[PDB]
Amino acid sequence: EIRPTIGQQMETGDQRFGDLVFRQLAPNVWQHTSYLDMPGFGAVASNGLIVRDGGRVLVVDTAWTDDQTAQILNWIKQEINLPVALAVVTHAHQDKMGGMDALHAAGIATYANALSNQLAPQEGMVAAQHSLTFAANGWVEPATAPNFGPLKVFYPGPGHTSDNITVGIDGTDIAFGGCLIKDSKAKSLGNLGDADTEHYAASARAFGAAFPKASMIVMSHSAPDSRAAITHTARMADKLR
Numbered sequence: 001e002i003r004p005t006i007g008q009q010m011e012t013g014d015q016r017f018g019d020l021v022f023r024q025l026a027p028n029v030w031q032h033t034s035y036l037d038m039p040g041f042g043a044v045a046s047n048g049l050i051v052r053d054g055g056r057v058l059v060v061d062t063a064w065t066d067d068q069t070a071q072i073l074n075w076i077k078q079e080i081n082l083p084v085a086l087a088v089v090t091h092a093h094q095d096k097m098g099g100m101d102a103l104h105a106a107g108i109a110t111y112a113n114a115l116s117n118q119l120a121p122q123e124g125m126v127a128a129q130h131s132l133t134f135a136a137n138g139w140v141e142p143a144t145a146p147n148f149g150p151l152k153v154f155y156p157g158p159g160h161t162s163d164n165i166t167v168g169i170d171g172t173d174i175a176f177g178g179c180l181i182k183d184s185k186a187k188s189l190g191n192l193g194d195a196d197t198e199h200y201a202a203s204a205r206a207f208g209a210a211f212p213k214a215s216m217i218v219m220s221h222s223a224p225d226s227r228a229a230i231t232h233t234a235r236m237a238d239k240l241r
């Protein structure tokens, strides 16, 4: 089994498939986990989501690479056997957008914050094919997110990056914080190289308030946690100001 240097370990309830791990979170929701080997350091796990919505599947975040992302699509075909309608990617970093070309080669419609698409070329990424825009309170403009089914996209403000977005899964008690949110026992906020240290705490709290009844908080580099992940992340971020 895969034992990453950074990221949750494999536990009961995880399925290894190729180089990835998949974990069912709800009857219609799975977490995908992929690993980037860094020289001298070992593997860094990154998580995203797969959601079944009737006769189609929706994806949140790519894997770190195109080949890993193709493996996610192969898991979906094996385990669910339904077409992927769209993917939402949650900011212009490799862990979230590194596999765009695999989605595009598969014919999957891709969506990201307009700002992520504008930043992608600067970050060594390929832009999504569609841009999401947001209201002044963070909620996505619905005409930009057509036919998103249960995915409720919210821009919480600058934090981990200026472009980070989050996704609630309507009809469940799950919300996805991506790299913005760290787990309740984390010692650090991760890579702050692109972060907005002034606004981070408010942005973490705004994610909590956008999805006030989400009890299972999914994030990029830890196992799903309680809402203490949100509150702890904000408390860490209070120290940055």
Ligand SMILES: COc1cccc(OC)c1C(=O)N[C@H](C(=O)O)[C@@H]1N[C@@H](C(=O)O)C(C)(C)S1
Binding pocket: 036, 038, 044, 092, 093, 094, 095, 096, 123, 124, 179, 180, 189, 190, 191, 192, 193, 220, 221
């Ligand atoms: C353009 O992106 C990259 C290029 C090369 C290597 C990378 O990660 C090792 C990445 C890249 O995607 N870096 C991200 C980032 O900088 O936020 C990752 N997310 C961080 C986080 O959630 O705190 C991390 C797990 C410490 S690294």
Ligand SMILES: [Zn+2]
Binding pocket: 091, 092, 093, 160, 161, 179
């Ligand atoms: Zn990032």
Ligand SMILES: [Zn+2]
Binding pocket: 046, 095, 179, 220, 221
């Ligand atoms: Zn990350």
